[PDB]
Design a binder for this molecule. Structure first.
Ligand code: UDP
Ligand code: UDP
Ligand code: UDP
Ligand code: UDP
Ligand code: UDP
Ligand code: UDP
Ligand code: MG
Ligand code: MG
Ligand code: MG
Ligand code: MG
Ligand code: MG
Ligand code: MG
Lengths: 152, 152, 152, 152, 152, 152
């Protein structure tokens, strides 16, 4: 939806425990994206198994699901032009060893299993993840007065 | 409840619009308090009238309610020793003119009607506000690994 | 003039040399004040003797004038409600030893003669200083889209 | 010129409105470059048409000129070794979508038309732009005590 | 000794564990004080009992000694005008509940037993503590190029 | 040694003089590495000639040795997975002109001779440099409570 494109991000348990929620949110805010949903939740294994359905055959799947269910996550939806692709760039490579300094994982993480945050990998993935984690009435439309200074 | 004391905070519409959500959360995180609930909501006038019931006879009540209903707020609950009183200190005086530099309002605001954030003014106020804004199942218990370094 | 009140600030040579110009500007920006004039200048002794006319009988006058003429300063005008008094609070006490942490001098300076910045001490002082340092056509009126979130 | 190389930078209207002037200045300061001119101006369309003469055949030229004339810009000259090329690197690609995190545009912008800042693209361009925007007597020589720690 | 006054600071185990060493050092650096000694050590109970000799009859003494011996501390000596008194101001009140925002303890701590840092409380205390924790040959004299911009 | 890998880092004299010690330490802290040794020292030419033995035939060797002996350095050892390689990435290319923004040299330096920091270039180099700069009893083992959130 051009500037109405949306992505799903989640601060993983390690991000909450290391007190980096503010830091992470601040990076998306300063970039210009619009926060349209946010909540702290404890996700069920049932929800996480669907979230990570595509990874079901992978050897880390079981531990990934257990870990993501082990503590609070901060679920979020962000809106803006190219937000899915750009979010992934801000976050950095899956494996923090390949994420350059300046990215979230490049600055804050070491190991792939403790890489702070999840972000949708495509517009289609984001659509699915947003619907899985949030009801329609948790996604807010608000008139963004900053928008005039971010978009032509 | 000692170290289990809780307070309710809300980033007002001006805080969201000015992109200070991360900045505000980061201040409470770095202080050591535990985030136990968080959501972006559009509060109803009905909720706000009860939230501000003690101010009903004051002439700014109506415009305060309308303003707080005018756009998204970020509702939060924070836990720790003396969190209500300490939160109020971090926020600063109601009127930003009286809030010293180092406080949120001292650093970021000018006028009383645009003062970025609400915080409970007492343990009793927090009890009521927490119940009004959040269900029990939105308040998360998590084992805080930082706690050993914040509390004796 | 209410929200149209203006003050004159100058980053002294120590602030330029220590690379704190950005830092200082950012504190006024984040507070919500409107930047209406800015320039890097080398002030003449003639200008400075009049700028500090009220200090002419004081023993530090001569050295203060010579110092402020010794290198570039960053001259500025900021606009907003109570900007003169609030600016002075953000800056902190004249003698940095009495300036609490959170203030510019509290955070960044040690000695009274190297205290980073000048700010007008009154609306009348600001009127004079603005006229003395800037032409009317250097003071810019611009429509401040942040103003809606700083003022009722 | 070596370490005396100079570039012209301007914070565009979006940078002023979003309160990123100090943030931008601070990045050049912390890098070690020397600020040799600075002013807040409202540029005429006449000046801007000459500034962007090489872009006259491009479809965005008209809107670019109108936009840059629409509000204050912060004009600047910075001095140091390789300052033109290095400035461009710190700013990031023209299109923020191609600018990595860590760059100004990578961190703060989304769209090409709202990309915060202009920087000269060559030593020759900088010479022209500096002369177009500043008089000789606005470019200051000062003894930079940090220079001993930036240059061998 | 005027500008040659020195104080002893130590980042307590909680400060190391919470990753606030750099943050703390940066505050003294940005203030203008001169770092003249620094090391990561594990203090013995024997050293700490003498360090806190004046507190020997107090009920928290035993736990304070055990805690400070429980993990690494970062020992430091800082030099500058009024450094003992000013350090204490930057650190904030012993009990973080009384330490305003802007101070280290005001911003980063909650409880008196986990208050991040020790600073000498007097010139006499600093003399003793410096001698107890560091040899003369660990205290470095260096020519401080920033000094001209901090001191008249 | 996996997560027990260690590297040697030193803040060069320019890093101390420009007050970037805290800033540099903070970057390694926030990345998740464990600080296992730290001291401010004045290195002898004899030690530095061995430190840089591999560069003995290079034309900058003499000046490099003299410079590194000219003022205090902050010697450090950091521990964690892939710490040698990752440290080098965080620091950035030898020549700051090739170091992107987000890296220490990319953000803070201009010239190769004033590039703020040394980091070992291999596990073998780190082992040698650690032995050359530190005694065994200066390298501290401590139980890292953050480790659970950085490593699986
Ligand atoms: O060897 C691996 C690869 C991936 N993951 C985790 O699986 C998550 C989702 O995997 P995916 O390949 O989808 O990466 P993403 O798209 O989240 O970067 C990652 O973010 C990692 O935390 C893991 O634990 N081990
Ligand atoms: O004259 C006033 C007093 C208060 N308020 C607003 O009303 C809120 C609640 O007022 P209260 O007296 O409860 O102060 P608080 O508890 O928020 O410090 C404040 O935070 C202000 O935004 C206002 O607009 N005008
Ligand atoms: O004993 C003194 C008092 C003042 N000043 C300097 O002179 C400036 C102007 O003095 P004034 O009394 O106007 O203080 P201000 O209004 O700047 O706080 C101060 O900012 C200091 O930099 C000084 O060097 N010594
Ligand atoms: O397709 C385009 C290309 C450029 N620009 C704007 O035009 C400015 C100047 O264009 P130029 O190609 O000179 O880029 P720059 O030198 O600023 O990177 C850019 O910075 C953009 O703001 C635009 O709006 N659309
Ligand atoms: O009731 C108390 C008082 C003090 N302390 C600890 O003991 C240290 C030293 O106490 P002192 O009175 O010397 O305070 P300081 O000089 O550190 O402010 C403090 O910093 C606290 O960490 C404590 O645990 N409980
Ligand atoms: O042409 C050169 C190359 C290197 N160096 C300095 O010598 C140090 C060691 O050089 P080396 O190639 O070992 O680089 P490093 O491993 O430190 O990146 C560098 O960090 C520079 O400070 C220099 O002055 N000139
Ligand atoms: Mg994935
Ligand atoms: Mg209230
Ligand atoms: Mg005055
Ligand atoms: Mg161009
Ligand atoms: Mg004491
Ligand atoms: Mg090398």
């Amino acid at each position: 939806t051009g500037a109405h494109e949306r992505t799903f991000l989640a601060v993983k348990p390690d991000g909450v425990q290391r007190r980096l929620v503010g830091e992470i949110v601040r990076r998306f805010e300063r970039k210009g994206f619009k926060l349209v949903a946010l909540k702290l939740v404890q996700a069920s294994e049932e929800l996480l198994r669907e979230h990570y359905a595509e990874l079901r055959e992978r050897p880390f799947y079981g531990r990934l699901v257990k870990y993501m269910a082990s503590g609070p996550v901060v679920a979020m939806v962000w809106q803006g032009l190219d937000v899915v692709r750009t979010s992934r760039a801000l976050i950095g490579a899956t494996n923090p060893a390949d994420a350059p300094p300046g990215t979230i994982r490049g600055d804050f993480c070491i190991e792939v299993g403790k890489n702070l945050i999840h972000g949708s990998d495509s517009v289609e993935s984001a659509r699915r993840e947003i619907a899985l984690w949030f009801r329609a009435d948790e996604l807010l439309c608000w008139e963004d007065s900053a928008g005039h200074w971010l978009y032509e």
